[PDB]
Design an enzyme around this catalytic site. Structure first.
Site, PDB file in Angstrom:
ATOM      1  CG  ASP A  15      -0.293  -0.202   2.541  1.00 48.92           C
ATOM      2  OD1 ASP A  15       0.925   0.156   2.751  1.00 48.92           O
ATOM      3  OD2 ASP A  15      -1.040  -0.591   3.437  1.00 48.92           O
ATOM      4  NE  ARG A  29      -0.671   3.023   4.442  1.00 51.37           N
ATOM      5  CZ  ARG A  29      -1.876   2.461   4.385  1.00 51.37           C
ATOM      6  NH1 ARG A  29      -2.649   2.582   3.270  1.00 51.37           N
ATOM      7  NH2 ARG A  29      -2.291   1.718   5.404  1.00 51.37           N
ATOM      8  CG  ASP A  34      -3.703  -2.016   7.006  1.00 55.35           C
ATOM      9  OD1 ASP A  34      -2.633  -1.465   6.742  1.00 55.35           O
ATOM     10  OD2 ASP A  34      -3.917  -2.619   8.076  1.00 55.35           O
ATOM     11  CB  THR A  35      -1.185  -4.276   2.019  1.00 53.24           C
ATOM     12  OG1 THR A  35      -0.212  -3.234   2.245  1.00 53.24           O
ATOM     13  CG2 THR A  35      -1.951  -4.016   0.739  1.00 53.24           C
ATOM     14  CD  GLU A  37       3.032  -2.881   7.875  1.00 51.36           C
ATOM     15  OE1 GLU A  37       4.057  -2.510   7.241  1.00 51.36           O
ATOM     16  OE2 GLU A  37       1.997  -2.152   7.964  1.00 51.36           O
ATOM     17  NE  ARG A  75       2.795   6.974   5.321  1.00 51.16           N
ATOM     18  CZ  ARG A  75       2.263   5.860   5.826  1.00 51.16           C
ATOM     19  NH1 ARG A  75       2.796   4.695   5.552  1.00 51.16           N
ATOM     20  NH2 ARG A  75       1.165   5.895   6.564  1.00 51.16           N
TER      21      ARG A  75
HETATM   22  C1  LIG Z   1      -4.027   5.378   5.121  1.00 50.33           C
HETATM   23  C2  LIG Z   1      -3.855   6.599   6.135  1.00 50.33           C
HETATM   24  C3  LIG Z   1      -2.935   6.295   7.129  1.00 50.33           C
HETATM   25  N1  LIG Z   1      -2.613   7.241   8.101  1.00 50.33           N
HETATM   26  C4  LIG Z   1      -1.683   6.936   9.215  1.00 50.33           C
HETATM   27  C5  LIG Z   1      -2.505   6.240  10.338  1.00 50.33           C
HETATM   28  C6  LIG Z   1      -1.539   5.283  11.024  1.00 50.33           C
HETATM   29  O1  LIG Z   1      -0.866   6.004  12.119  1.00 50.33           O
HETATM   30  P1  LIG Z   1       0.058   5.064  13.022  1.00 50.33           P
HETATM   31  O2  LIG Z   1       1.480   5.060  12.353  1.00 50.33           O
HETATM   32  O3  LIG Z   1       0.149   5.924  14.251  1.00 50.33           O
HETATM   33  O4  LIG Z   1      -0.417   3.588  13.237  1.00 50.33           O
HETATM   34  C7  LIG Z   1      -0.564   4.960   9.818  1.00 50.33           C
HETATM   35  C8  LIG Z   1      -0.966   3.660   9.139  1.00 50.33           C
HETATM   36  O5  LIG Z   1      -0.120   3.548   7.971  1.00 50.33           O
HETATM   37  P2  LIG Z   1       0.595   2.182   7.675  1.00 50.33           P
HETATM   38  O6  LIG Z   1      -0.568   1.134   7.548  1.00 50.33           O
HETATM   39  O7  LIG Z   1       1.363   2.356   6.413  1.00 50.33           O
HETATM   40  O8  LIG Z   1       1.515   1.729   8.877  1.00 50.33           O
HETATM   41  O9  LIG Z   1      -0.701   6.029   8.848  1.00 50.33           O
HETATM   42  C9  LIG Z   1      -3.247   8.426   8.010  1.00 50.33           C
HETATM   43  O10 LIG Z   1      -3.016   9.334   8.883  1.00 50.33           O
HETATM   44  N2  LIG Z   1      -4.154   8.741   7.037  1.00 50.33           N
HETATM   45  C10 LIG Z   1      -4.548   7.829   6.115  1.00 50.33           C
HETATM   46  O11 LIG Z   1      -5.335   8.113   5.261  1.00 50.33           O
HETATM   47 CA   LIG Z   2       0.033  -1.408   5.897  1.00 57.08          CA
END
Ligand SMILES: Cc1cn([C@H]2C[C@H](OP(=O)(O)O)[C@@H](COP(=O)(O)O)O2)c(=O)[nH]c1=O
Ligand SMILES: [Ca+2]
EC number: 3.1.31.1
Length: 129
Positions: A15, A29, A34-35, A37, A75
């Site tokens: 993702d 992103r 959510d994929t 890890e 991102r």
């Molecule tokens: C997909 C997305 C993720 N995020 C943030 C939430 C999560 O915070 P946390 O890092 O605190 O868990 C993280 C999840 O991304 P990843 O799934 O790539 O780890 O990215 C956003 O803020 N907005 C979004 O639209």
């Molecule tokens: Ca992910």
């Protein structure tokens, strides 16, 4: 919403992808998914799926939603298209991502992706196997 040009710099994982957007390298992103890890079940299959889709594309596009365009990690938040096909949706339709992180006002394609997830589940694909 509007599709804008980008070019592939490098596949990252299911993702996230590194793209050049307005001439500047950025990690994107994918909205609303959510994929797993890379170290979790189907994480390598999700990564491989996205990699193939963006590496094979002649044309990559990014489409921002109505709300925030960058997340707290810097991102870009977008829907990513490979030769006109949305990567976010394709991953969901294949059971390689779950609809997730649905935040109010960046959720234009929410119902399109939930429809894909329902079909992936009915077919018991991958994550839903
Ligand atoms: C997909 C997305 C993720 N995020 C943030 C939430 C999560 O915070 P946390 O890092 O605190 O868990 C993280 C999840 O991304 P990843 O799934 O790539 O780890 O990215 C956003 O803020 N907005 C979004 O639209
Ligand atoms: Ca992910």
């Amino acid at each position: 919403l509007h599709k804008e040009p980008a070019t592939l710099i490098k596949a990252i994982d299911g993702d996230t992808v590194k793209l050049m957007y307005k001439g500047q390298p950025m990690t994107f992103r994918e909205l609303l998914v959510d994929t797993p890890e890379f170290n979790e079940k189907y994480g390598p299959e999700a990564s491989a799926f996205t990699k193939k889709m963006v590496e094979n594309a002649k044309k990559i596009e990014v489409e921002f939603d109505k709300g925030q365009r960058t997340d707290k990690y810097g991102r870009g938040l977008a829907y990513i298209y490979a030769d006109g096909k949305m990567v976010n949706e394709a991953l969901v339709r294949q059971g390689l991502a779950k609809v997730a992180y649905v935040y109010k006002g960046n959720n234009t394609h929410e119902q399109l992706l939930r429809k894909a997830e329902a079909q992936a589940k009915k077919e018991k694909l991958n994550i839903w196997s």
